[PDB]
Curated annotation (Swiss-Prot), chain A:
Effect of residue 128 to C: In TBRS; somatic mutation
Disease implicated: Tatton-Brown-Rahman syndrome: An overgrowth syndrome characterized by a distinctive facial appearance, tall stature and intellectual disability. Facial gestalt is characterized by a round face, heavy horizontal eyebrows and narrow palpebral fissures. Less common features include atrial septal defects, seizures, umbilical hernia, and scoliosis. Leukemia, acute myelogenous: A subtype of acute leukemia, a cancer of the white blood cells. AML is a malignant disease of bone marrow characterized by maturational arrest of hematopoietic precursors at an early stage of development. Clonal expansion of myeloid blasts occurs in bone marrow, blood, and other tissue. Myelogenous leukemias develop from changes in cells that normally produce neutrophils, basophils, eosinophils and monocytes.
Residue stretches making up the SAM-dependent MTase C5-type domain: 13-279
Effect of residue 27 to P: In TBRS; somatic mutation
Recorded consequence of changing residue 249 to C: In TBRS and AML; somatic variant in AML
Organism for this UniProt entry: Homo sapiens
Portion held of the full protein: 622 to 912 of 912
Name assigned to this protein: DNA (cytosine-5)-methyltransferase 3A
Lineage, uppermost ranks: Eukaryota, Metazoa, Chordata, Craniata, Vertebrata
Curated annotation (Swiss-Prot), chain B:
Subunit structure: Heterotetramer composed of 1 DNMT3A homodimer and 2 DNMT3L subunits (DNMT3L-DNMT3A-DNMT3A-DNMT3L). Interacts with UBC9, PIAS1 and PIAS2. Binds the ZBTB18 transcriptional repressor. Interacts with SETDB1. Associates with HDAC1 through its ADD domain. Interacts with UHRF1. Interacts with DNMT1 and DNMT3B. Interacts with the PRC2/EED-EZH2 complex. Interacts with MPHOSPH8. Interacts with histone H3 that is not methylated at 'Lys-4' (H3K4). Interacts with SPOCD1.
Disease involvement: Tatton-Brown-Rahman syndrome: An overgrowth syndrome characterized by a distinctive facial appearance, tall stature and intellectual disability. Facial gestalt is characterized by a round face, heavy horizontal eyebrows and narrow palpebral fissures. Less common features include atrial septal defects, seizures, umbilical hernia, and scoliosis. Leukemia, acute myelogenous: A subtype of acute leukemia, a cancer of the white blood cells. AML is a malignant disease of bone marrow characterized by maturational arrest of hematopoietic precursors at an early stage of development. Clonal expansion of myeloid blasts occurs in bone marrow, blood, and other tissue. Myelogenous leukemias develop from changes in cells that normally produce neutrophils, basophils, eosinophils and monocytes.
Zn finger (GATA-type) location: 18-48
Tissue spec: Highly expressed in fetal tissues, skeletal muscle, heart, peripheral blood mononuclear cells, kidney, and at lower levels in placenta, brain, liver, colon, spleen, small intestine and lung.
Record: active site: 235
Domain SAM-dependent MTase C5-type, first and last residues per copy: 159-425
Chain positions with S-methylcysteine modification: 235
Effect caused by changing residue 395 to C: In TBRS and AML; somatic variant in AML
Descriptive protein name: DNA (cytosine-5)-methyltransferase 3A
Domain notes: The PWWP domain is essential for targeting to pericentric heterochromatin. It specifically recognizes and binds trimethylated 'Lys-36' of histone H3 (H3K36me3).
Resulting phenotype, residue 415 to S: In TBRS; somatic mutation
Record's function text: Required for genome-wide de novo methylation and is essential for the establishment of DNA methylation patterns during development. DNA methylation is coordinated with methylation of histones. It modifies DNA in a non-processive manner and also methylates non-CpG sites. May preferentially methylate DNA linker between 2 nucleosomal cores and is inhibited by histone H1. Plays a role in paternal and maternal imprinting. Required for methylation of most imprinted loci in germ cells. Acts as a transcriptional corepressor for ZBTB18.
Encoding gene per record: DNMT3A
Amino acid sequence: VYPPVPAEKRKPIRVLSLFDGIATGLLVLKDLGIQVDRYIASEVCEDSITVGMVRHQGKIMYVGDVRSVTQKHIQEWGPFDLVIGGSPCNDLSIVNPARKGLYEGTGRLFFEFYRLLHDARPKEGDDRPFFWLFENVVAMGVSDKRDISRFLESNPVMIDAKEVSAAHRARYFWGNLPGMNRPLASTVNDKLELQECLEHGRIAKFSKVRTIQHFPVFMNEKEDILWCTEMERVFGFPVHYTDVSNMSRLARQRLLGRSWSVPVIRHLFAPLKEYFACV
Amino acid sequence: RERLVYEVRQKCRNIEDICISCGSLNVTLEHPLFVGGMCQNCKNCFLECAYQYDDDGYQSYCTICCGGREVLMCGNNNCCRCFCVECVDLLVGPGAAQAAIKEDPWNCYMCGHKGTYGLLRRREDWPSRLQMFFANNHDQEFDPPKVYPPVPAEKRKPIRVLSLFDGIATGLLVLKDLGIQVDRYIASEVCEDSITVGMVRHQGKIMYVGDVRSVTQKHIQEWGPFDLVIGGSPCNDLSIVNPARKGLYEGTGRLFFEFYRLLHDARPKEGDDRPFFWLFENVVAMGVSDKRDISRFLESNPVMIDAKEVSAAHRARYFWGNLPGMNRPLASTVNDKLELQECLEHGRIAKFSKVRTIQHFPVFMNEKEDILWCTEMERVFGFPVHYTDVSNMSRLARQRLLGRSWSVPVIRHLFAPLKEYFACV
Ligand SMILES: Nc1ncnc2c1ncn2[C@@H]1O[C@H](CSCC[C@H](N)C(=O)O)[C@@H](O)[C@H]1O
Ligand SMILES: Nc1ncnc2c1ncn2[C@@H]1O[C@H](CSCC[C@H](N)C(=O)O)[C@@H](O)[C@H]1O
Ligand SMILES: [Zn+2]
Ligand SMILES: [Zn+2]
Ligand SMILES: [Zn+2]
């Protein structure tokens, strides 16, 4: 536990964000009104790059693959105040029909986070505030979870988004952010019922959508999928967030599906306001 | 015309006494863009052909004669004109076309910086003459539309609209933007995506009908008196942009009459002097006898309105109707974006200032050639941001859906004096 820095002394936060996806982290930091000095992001999927580019207005400095980031890169891109990331979950999740393996691909990429975390960490005796967050799914192996806990040298917190959002999104969060254990509060802006997240003219038999009776909606006495803008509303994203480039619906749903739940991430990132500068 | 222009350059015949399109001696008009006379058959050809563009975004035929077998496309940015080899042999000289092919950065004669050549010289008020040229269509003489006296403000009531070929509910959207109270908005449409767009964006208010051909006069009577009937025939088959142009009169022409029928069904009787208004829309790249038959049946003179005046698209459209002030000039408000660049997303730069939609991919982003994004196509046509992102549809379909639609500030311009006849929010 690092002691709080006085308000006049606070500075803009610097974030290294691995497996950034659609820039949920920076978006949440903006929503909290924290000044962001810089936001370095590694990602490989072009659609997600584009989403971040447009929605965050060129501010994000885009890097390539995480495996091309050296310790020299970490040093020359300035000291980092917050390192965040979530390993690929599509291969760990049981939803993908082609489950060739779980430890392959995703597990290797985990260590990449691990490496860069140590690269971004201040030395002992440098008592400057430094924070990190790793995210993963709950449907994972026990020895896998143990090895992750061993390497990050911490105990996981399971947080389920149902407490604050209209999705069943149970996720592990390792990290040293203050108040990562405390209970989740749902603000009035958050929508605990699926029906509030639907478009007008639609009615939901479901109150929650399970995403980690396939088609959740009865509209005009017919069974339909949630629309992309509603999937955004379920996860807490701003309205029409992923409509940037010309991409197919299947891809755009997939893109939204991988992402972090916005009010959960707001809940986690909120006490960082006590350590950095405000807008 | 080779021997006749031989006598023209020998100072024995005036170029203004000869039809520079086909060499006819039956000179009635002057050519609107360049020096010479113009015969009536060439006027009909010019009406059909001038604003016809190929799939490359350049003109389908020569700009001069509206024919030509092999054409010269123009190098200058945003210019889409073509000049066939035959025309250049008279006006610039023999072999000038074959020599002009070899000039790799070439500018066409509407874009030439000098503006003055030997036999061909560009006439100075050509945009004014282009605007006058449609007023020059007095062959289809018709009586002026009946002007209805303004209803006092306290007496005004909410407008009722019958909207055929509604598409994505551009009309109701514009009426909302003008702040006119809408009692009801009956709409016929058949494409499910467009139905959905209207449903969501206009919040269940729209009462959806099926095919226009299932709407009877009894239907028209029992759905209450209508104050405004609007519509635009399918333009995809009339447009030269669709590769599969099987016909022009088939499909689209038949559906035109549907509008015609329901218009008469919705019209008040003589002696019923209640205000009533109607609008029909169509493309400029259409047949002359087609345009005549349309003018004959709607018993009116078309107004051509080009969206370039108020928006970032070349969208030249005919508007028949009796709305007051349909002839008056178009004003572009500060909210409207006359440059393509203002309509782009951040991080993108447009070499183009206008997009021609009636160098295929209009955008240089990160030193690469890309299509406009769907939300930008919405911004080009004046639609609200993220207007067509309702259901889960493909990009090709969603672009197509946007492409057919009416230009929003043009429709705002047309619908604006209806505020003097109906109730406000
Ligand atoms: N080698 C690699 N380097 C960086 N990102 C990668 C990668 N391989 C896969 N990814 C990306 O890692 C992401 C994992 S899920 C990302 C969730 C993210 N927090 C969000 O809010 O969207 C995927 O988007 C995938 O595109
Ligand atoms: N039989 C029919 N009845 C009603 N609409 C039809 C039809 N056949 C085709 N259409 C529709 O007519 C439209 C012509 S273009 C529509 C433009 C409209 N003003 C807009 O703003 O979108 C197309 O959307 C097409 O889907
Ligand atoms: Zn002629
Ligand atoms: Zn020609
Ligand atoms: Zn030119």
